[PDB]
Structure 1
Amino acid sequence: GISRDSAHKRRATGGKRKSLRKKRKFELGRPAANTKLGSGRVHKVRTRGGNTKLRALRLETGNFAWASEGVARKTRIADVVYNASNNELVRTKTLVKNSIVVIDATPFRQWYEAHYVLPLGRKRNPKHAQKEDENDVLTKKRSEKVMKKYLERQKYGKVEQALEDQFTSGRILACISSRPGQCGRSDGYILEGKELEFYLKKIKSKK
């Protein structure tokens, strides 16, 4: 099969090592995943001793985690924008580790004003001319049960300018942090502070 250790592959002087141990199983390699953005496939491969890992060709959904929260909301995966290993992997939309990715931005925002009821980032006020009627069904204060906890915050609720602009579009930049050919999933964190400003300078200034 594909082999993974140096039976071939000449030495540090430049010299050809000759033959070396006909071909052994324990140094095998496998054909890759190339997990596209097709919805829902997993093949599982029987690995070294007794085990199994999940070769997840064609995934579509991922357990993404806003790292500055301690939250991890599952979304779907929309676009594969940037990748440092290649551009053959961007263009064919293949998911491997840290591809910069675009997810949903919605299951975080509903989680955001659940615990951090402060409305931001706010959309166009022509839509916001009336509520149904949210600001009392948010907290209502009870005089006084569990819920004054929503106002010794507002120290947390000033998420940065370059992230709240990316929430109003309803799609946010994230980053894969799993091994989709191995772990069977494409999870990850999202770009917030300076991982953001690097990977976004990489896009709009290059074009």
Structure 2
Amino acid sequence: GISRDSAHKRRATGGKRKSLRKKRKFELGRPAANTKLGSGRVHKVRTRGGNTKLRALRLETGNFAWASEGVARKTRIADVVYNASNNELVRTKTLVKNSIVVIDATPFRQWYEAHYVLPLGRKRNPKHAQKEDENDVLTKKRSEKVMKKYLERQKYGKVEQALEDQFTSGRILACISSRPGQCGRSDGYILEGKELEFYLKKIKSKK
């Protein structure tokens, strides 16, 4: 294998410090995940003894947080549009850390209608004019405190219009925050404020 030490790499002015204790077991690193977006597989391996680090391969889904509240919802990752550095990881569609991935916009719609009674996004009327079962679970009037609690609530549904265009189309972007190669998950959060409006210039203008 190849170790992760300084066995290579001539010292600071050019010359070659040659050998000095050829090899050690602990000082090595293994071949990486290279996790394509797939159908959710996983593998177990020994680490430095006792610890069980879990890597990911051929992964499908994950749970992803929200910005202004920290609302973590699990949903199927659809696809990818962008990775941060290696375009030769973009084209093969490989799951890495904090790359620009589009996910779902589905479960955040139904989860939020307690606080965000106005449904996000605006679904098409004349084919979805029937409710299965939307309009009753929006308000219901409750004859009680919770609808009255939702009156001083829904004062925070002043969200960004760009995701409101994106929620009504049903494909939101997000940023997978955790490490795929340390715990075997795809855990993240939606980019909302400033890097959301930034990276579309990195995508739609380069489209």
Deviations 1:45-64 (A, max 9, x none): 21112211111111101111
Query: What TM-score results when the alignment is normalised by the length of structure 1?
Result: 0.92
Offset of 1:85 from its aligned partner? 2.0
Q: Deviations over 1:126-174 (max 9, x none)?
A: 3454556744442333332333111102320111111110111111111
State the match for 1:137 in structure 2: 137
Contact 1:8 1:19 in 2 (8 A): no
Q: Deviations over 1:80-129 (max 9, x none)?
A: 11011201111111101011111111010011213321234313333454
Alpha carbons 1:96, 1:178 under 8 Å: kept: no
| Number of residue equivalences | 207
Name the structure 1 match of 2:61. 61
Please name the residue that 1:159 is paired with. Answer: 159
| Counterparts of 1:133 and 1:85, CA distance in 2 | 44
Q: Give the whole-Å Cα distance in 2 for the aligned partners of 1:165 and 1:140.
A: 27
Say if 1:53 and 1:161 are closer, same or farther in 2 by CA, change over 3 A.
same
The answer as to whether partners of 1:173 and 1:190 remain within 8 angstroms in 2 is yes
The answer for unaligned runs of 5 or more in structure 2 is none
Give the aligned partner of residue 112 of structure 2: 112
Note closer, same or farther for the CA distance 1:134–1:108 as it changes in structure 2 (3 Å cut): closer
How has the CA–CA distance of structure 1 residues 4 and 131 changed in structure 2, closer, same or farther, with 3 Å as cutoff? closer
Query: Would you say the 8 A contact 2:101–2:173 is kept in 1?
Result: yes
Aligned in 2, Cα 1:15/1:185: closer, same or farther, shift over 3 Å? Answer: same
**Given the superposition, is the C-alpha separation of residues 137 and 28 from structure 1 closer, same or farther in structure 2, using an over 3 Å criterion?**
closer
Instruction: Out of 118-127 and 78-87, give the one that drifted further.
Output: 118-127
- In structure 1, the gaps of 5 or more residues are none
State the 1:14 CA deviation.
Answer: 1.0
Looking at structure 2, the residues matched to 137 and 73 of structure 1 have their Cα atoms a distance apart, in angstroms, of 20
CA 1:35–1:132 in structure 2 vs 1: closer, same or farther (change >3 Å)? closer
TM-score w.r.t. length of structure 2: 0.92
Change (3 A) 1:133 1:45: closer
Q: Deviations over 1:2-55 (max 9, x none)?
A: 200102210111111111211011210100110111102101121112211111
Report if aligned partners of 1:57, 1:181 keep a CA contact under 8 Å in 2: no
Distance (whole Å) between structure 1 residues aligned to residue 114 and residue 90 of structure 2: 35
Is contact 2:115-2:154 (8 Å) kept? Answer: no
| Runs of 4+ deviating beyond 2 Å | 123-147
Q: Using the alignment, how far apart are the partners of 1:65 and 1:26 within structure 2? A: 36
Q: Check conservation: 1:33, 1:57, Cα contact below 8 A.
A: yes
Question: In 2, are the aligned partners of 1:34 and 1:181 still within 8 Å (CA)?
Answer: no
Indicate if the aligned counterparts of 2:115 and 2:153 stay in contact, CA closer than 8 A.
no
Q: Give the match for residue 41 of structure 1.
A: 41
1:65, 1:133 → 2: CA distance?
A: 26
SS in 2 for 1:67: coil
Cα distance in 1, alignment partners of residues 134 and 96 from structure 2: 41
